[PDB]
Design brief:
10 strands, alpha/beta, ZnuA, zinc, Bact_metal-bind_prot9, zinc ion binding, Lipoprotein_PsaA-like, Rossmann fold, 4-stranded parallel beta sheet
Length: 265
């Protein structure tokens, strides 16, 4: 099996290992990449895997140790890929590491995954070559449809609770006003809520986007009295099932959630 750290990384692997082998994920749906911790059973899935794929230390800190013990042939660290390095975006930690939101980086990742697997399974060279060409052409169109859907949305100001979308937004021309650091289970106190509210108004935002782990109480609260719509983004694709075209669908979903709140002047 190919073992991915996060679900949308699994989406990339899933497209390359389609037919050929299984794909597993370690971050379960509902958890955030910056607070998880490896179960003993998680560590066992790693050691016994054909290929491990993660973003790197600066992101899934919770995988440094067990990965550090695997030989190079068994591991793709996305942030360290030759072709990824020049695509890293700034904004201690200074490069943005939410990399599965960059088609370009997804493309390098599939190539690297294709490289490792084909070295191991050379009989399956044919299913894999086909898999790679399938992903590339599927991603290209998706990129095309998603550009079309989002371009009429340039200049529609939004805020997000979690500033994780930079790669996607730079790629598709979308324009984030900023971000607020909120719970997602405990409504903020009056000082903080007023500062957030003041900015939604001062800057006349159209939307404010939450994540699915956000309690609707917290979100509803922030938009109450304003004229701002409430949206939900799913950057970890918890709504999406692993499979050949999971990645295409992931980006599609994500653009609809943007569109659905942002559309409407």
């Amino acid at each position: 099996a190919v073992v991915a750290s996060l679900k949308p990384v699994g989406f990339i692997a899933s497209a390359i290992a389609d037919g050929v082998t299984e794909t597993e994920v370690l971050l379960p749906d509902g958890a955030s990449e910056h607070d998880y911790s490896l179960r003993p059973s998680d560590v066992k899935r790693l050691q016994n895997a054909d290929l491990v794929v993660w973003v790197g230390p600066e992101m899934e800190a919770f995988m440094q140790k067990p990965v550090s013990k695997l030989p190079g042939a068994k591991q793709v660290t996305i942030a360290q890929l030759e072709d990824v390095k020049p695509l890293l975006m700034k904004s201690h930690g200074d490069f943005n590491m939410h990399l599965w939101l960059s088609p370009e980086i997804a493309r390098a990742t599939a190539v690297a995954i294709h490289g490792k697997l084909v070295e191991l399974m050379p009989q399956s060279r044919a299913k894999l070559d086909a898999n790679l060409k399938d992903f590339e052409a599927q991603l290209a169109s998706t990129e095309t449809q998603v550009g079309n859907e989002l371009a009429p949305l340039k200049g529609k100001g939004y805020f997000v609770f979690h500033d994780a979308y930079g790669y996607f937004e730079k790629q598709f021309g979308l324009t984030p006003l900023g971000h607020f650091t909120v719970n997602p289970e405990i409504q903020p106190g009056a000082q903080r809520l007023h500062e957030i509210r003041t900015q939604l108004v001062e800057q006349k935002a159209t939307c404010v986007f939450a994540e699915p782990q956000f309690r609707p109480a917290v979100v509803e609260s922030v938009a109450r009295g304003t004229s701002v719509r409430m949206g939900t983004l799913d950057p970890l694709g918890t709504n999406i099932k692993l499979g050949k075209t999971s990645y295409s669908e992931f980006l599609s979903q994500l653009a609809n959630q943007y569109a659905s709140c942002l559309k409407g002047d």
